[PDB]
């Protein structure tokens, strides 16, 4: 394996949970917003957002 520059797991979770900050509980639809925070020196792939 590479021993440096690859990964640093220091003070980072490998997944986060984000609570709703909007909820609409309409009769046939539901809306939810999330204010994402992508930290500095991190990168997100949206293929693993679900």
């Amino acid at each position: 394996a590479p021993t440096h520059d690859v990964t640093t797991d220091r003070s980072q979770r490998l997944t986060l949970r984000f609570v709703p900050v909007d909820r609409e509980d309409n009769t046939y639809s539901y809306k939810v917003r999330y204010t994402l925070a992508v930290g500095d020196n991190r990168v997100l792939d949206m293929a693993s957002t679900y």
């Binding site: 979770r13 986060l16 949970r17 984000f18 609570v19 204010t35 925070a37 930290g39």
Partner: protein
């Protein structure tokens, strides 16, 4: 005529109130009913109950 000679003792004093400092009104020391105080950004829990 023989139901004149009944006796009756008072019912027991039974005091029902709350606990000493509202003990067992908030879950502590539990998981699955654990409380979370956390950022609104990343949302990292700052409460770990064991």
């Amino acid at each position: 005529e023989i139901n004149l000679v009944q006796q009756s003792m008072p019912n027991r004093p039974n005091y029902i109130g709350f606990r000493d400092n509202f003990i067992g009104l908030m879950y502590y020391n539990s998981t699955g009913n654990m409380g979370v105080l956390a950022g609104q950004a990343s949302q990292l829990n700052a409460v770990v109950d064991l």
